């Protein structure tokens, strides 16, 4: 139906979020802010200077700031800050103007394995959009340059924009860490430039299974077989390839796709099982040579059914 | 430090504000509303009996302005004029689109990349980045109901529209036109057996991608060898790779200067990768050589 091409890593239309991006400057430190109604949300380290990043005392640094300390700009117009407060690792700046482009929205905390669209921004101006998955080790493999902090991650659930991520930093392994819109970090990371490392990461088995279902839905079904497996037996095999242990909850999440295809989850696991033990023998799935793990069951239904927003 | 590397598309907001629904007879597809004009695939005027050998000249003359129903959300836009330009229809409406961004129509070259905003019934579904294949086809992800969807690039505040979706080839790839209605490739808008020319891997892009990996801190695939442009091509063509020209190398100049790796030396590395494979290793997380990133996309994502 979609073509013989292969699954495209599609991001949600970003228009509604672009309408919320602004630039926030505190002294010489400039980054991005999220403007919703009369509040601008941004990383608290915006109040930090060059040497204030090793181990900043945010509480004491903020005390020395007044509403006039923050320069907020939407396009070429200044947005007057009339109040400020810190919430975990975010700053909440009250402005005298409610964003006319505020979309229906909500803040949600994403869970490991789930995906979202990232709108990379610089100087309050959206530069690009791509799909990311919250890795099992609580980091995301994004693409960010200096000045990108404040950029946000989101999903669109029907007619509502669900914000789930705000960018704060990069780890030595070249991966990224951030918080939800309540300023709470995903993972054990802290917003300071100290020695911090992401734990060992694993392949999101739930997503790989969802991707195989997408392949079947698209007509790529050569890898399917006549057998089934137990969760226990599948996990013994999968964990050799550093795959996340599959749980009964993951099985259930795959329910809609299992129904659409009539293929029981454990039956698909048996297929995945053989793929890991015998490889693809040169063949491809959805035009791919490897097993994609950044497409959730929801992303599959979204792309295969043509859901609009 | 490393920036990371993703196949990112341009933000789609400026294009989302231009999408509308266009209906004629019982066929509904997407249209692009700019100022007081709506652009859409001319096959919207076809009936199930006109799919094989349609004469659009003859089909269109039998239409009037009221034969077209244009809708922006739940509001009807009155068509006050219509005309065909190559494979597109240009419908003049009685009201201007206030969301029209600064824009221009460009016909891109094979190998260049662009963002696609997949739409259905005039509503946005998703956005993704892709490359115009050397054979002019697009390896996209489209379901029926998606014609009228457009491809584009954004430079600052200006949207350069370069593609509008029209069809899918037997092989599963897609074909379309520029915003002047001229098809990319030897294709026509009718349901006849049509085949795309042989495709090739976009060599310039693979090289740009290797440079991306290097600026990002990965250098495992490099070697102490070098090669001539001619010797590289003799090997590359064996793997169905586009021949590399002196123009392509000059284009890689900036990336070459920034990394300290001579273009011909990078070609020597690519030469080794093609002949010996990746031995189970990965580059920028990929196990295959990626060709959907132009040299411009790399400098843009890796260095503003
Ligand atoms: C956003 C800041 C911004 O936009 O500021 C505008 C003035 C960045 C994003 C960063 C840019 C490069 N890619 C990105 O994603 N954040 C940022 O710079 C943070 C700010 C602090 C206050 C949280 N700093 C970092 O991300 C920093 N990371 C670290 O220091 C990290 C915790 N540790 C190590 O790198 C480390 C190495 C070793 C051997 O031990 N620890 C990087 C270096 C900038
Ligand atoms: C978009 C139109 C739309 O949205 O209409 C809604 C009412 C489609 C997009 C298409 C659907 C599936 N994937 C897609 O990308 N276009 C469209 O239907 C065209 C319309 C014609 C009038 C240009 N038709 C096709 O794309 C059609 N392709 C072909 O017929 C192809 C050129 N030839 C063959 O496939 C073939 C011919 C022979 C003898 O053997 N094979 C597809 C198949 C619908």
What are the defining features of this structure?
Thrombin, subunit H, seven-stranded antiparallel beta sheet, main proteinase (3clpro) structure, domain 3, 3 domains, homodimer, six-stranded mixed beta sheet, alpha+beta, 3C-like proteinase nsp5 (chain B)
Give the helix/strand layout.
The structure is a homodimer.
Chain A: H1 15-18, E1 21-26, E2 29-36, E3 39-43, H2 58-63, E4 70-74, E5 77-79, E6 81-87, E7 90-95, E8 105-107, E9 115-122, E10 125-133, E11 152-157, E12 160-170, E13 176-179, H3 205-217, H4 231-238, H5 248-253, H6 255-261, H7 265-278, H8 297-305
Parallel strand pairs in A: 8-12
Antiparallel strand pairs in A: 1-2, 1-4, 2-3, 3-7, 4-5, 6-7, 9-10, 9-11, 11-12, 12-13
Helix pairs in contact in A: 3-6, 3-8, 4-7
PDB class: hydrolase
Keywords: anti-parallel B-barrel, anti-parallel A-helices, Hydrolase
Assembly: dimeric
Describe the 3D structure:
Chain B: It is found in: Host cytoplasm; Host Golgi apparatus. Chain B: Residues 3-304 form the Peptidase C30 domain. The structure is a homodimer. Chain A has a seven-stranded antiparallel beta sheet, with no helix packed on it. In chain A, strands 8, 9, 10, 11, 12 and 13 form a six-stranded mixed beta sheet that branches. In chain A, strand 6 and strand 7 form a beta hairpin. Chain A has three domains: 1-18 and 104-201, Trypsin-like serine proteases (Thrombin, subunit H), CATH 2.40.10.10; 19-103, Trypsin-like serine proteases (Thrombin, subunit H); 202-305, Orthogonal Bundle (main proteinase (3clpro) structure, domain 3). The first copy, chain A, is α+β, with helices and mostly antiparallel strands and 309 residues long. Chain A is 22% helix and 26% strand. The two termini of chain A are 20 Å apart. The longest helix of chain A is centred in the last third of the chain and has 14 residues, at 265-278. The radius of gyration of chain A is 22 Å and the shape is elongated. The interface between A and B is large, with 46 and 50 residues. The structure holds ligand I12 (2 copies). One copy of the ligand */C(=C\C(=O)OCC)[C@H](C[C@@H]1CCNC1=O)NC(=O)[C@H](CC(C)C)NC(=O)[C@@H](NC(=O)[C@H](C)NC(=O)c1cc(C)on1)C(C)C binds next to strand 2 and strand 12 of chain A.
């Amino acid at each position: 139906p979609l073509g013989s091409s292969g699954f495209r890593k599609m991001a949600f239309p970003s228009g509604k979020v672009e309408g919320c991006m602004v630039q926030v400057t505190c002294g010489t430190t400039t980054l991005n802010g999220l403007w919703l109604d009369d509040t601008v949300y941004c990383p608290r380290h915006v109040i930090c200077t060059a040497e204030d990043m090793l181990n900043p005392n945010y509480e004491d640094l903020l005390i020395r700031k007044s509403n006039h300390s923050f320069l907020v700009q939407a396009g070429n117009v200044q947005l007057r800050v009339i109040g400020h407060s810190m919430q975990n690792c975010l700053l909440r700046l009250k402005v005298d103007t409610s964003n006319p482009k505020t979309p229906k929205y909500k803040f949600v905390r994403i869970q490991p394995g789930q995906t979202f669209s990232v709108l990379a921004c610089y100087n309050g101006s959206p530069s690009g959009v791509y799909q990311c998955a919250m890795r099992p080790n609580h980091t995301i493999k994004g693409s960010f340059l200096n000045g990108s902090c404040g950029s946000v991650g989101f999903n669109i659930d029907y007619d509502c924009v669900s914000f789930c991520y705000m960018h704060h930093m990069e780890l030595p392994t070249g991966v990224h860490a951030g918080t939800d819109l309540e300023g709470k970090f995903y993972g054990p990371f802290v917003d300071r430039q100290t020695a911090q490392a992401a734990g060992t990461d694993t392949t999101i088995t739930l997503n790989v299974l969802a991707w195989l279902y997408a392949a079947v839905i698209n007509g790529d079904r050569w890898f399917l077989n006549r057998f089934t497996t137990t969760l226990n037996d599948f996990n013994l095999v999968a964990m050799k390839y550093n795959y996340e242990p599959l749980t009964q909850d993951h099985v259930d999440i795959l329910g809609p796709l299992s129904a659409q295809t009539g293929i029981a989850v454990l039956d698909m696991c048996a297929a995945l099982k053989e793929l890991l033990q015998n490889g693809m023998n040169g063949r491809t799935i959805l035009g791919s040579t490897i097993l994609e793990d950044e497409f959730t069951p929801f992303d599959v239904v979204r792309q295969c059914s043509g859901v609009t927003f």
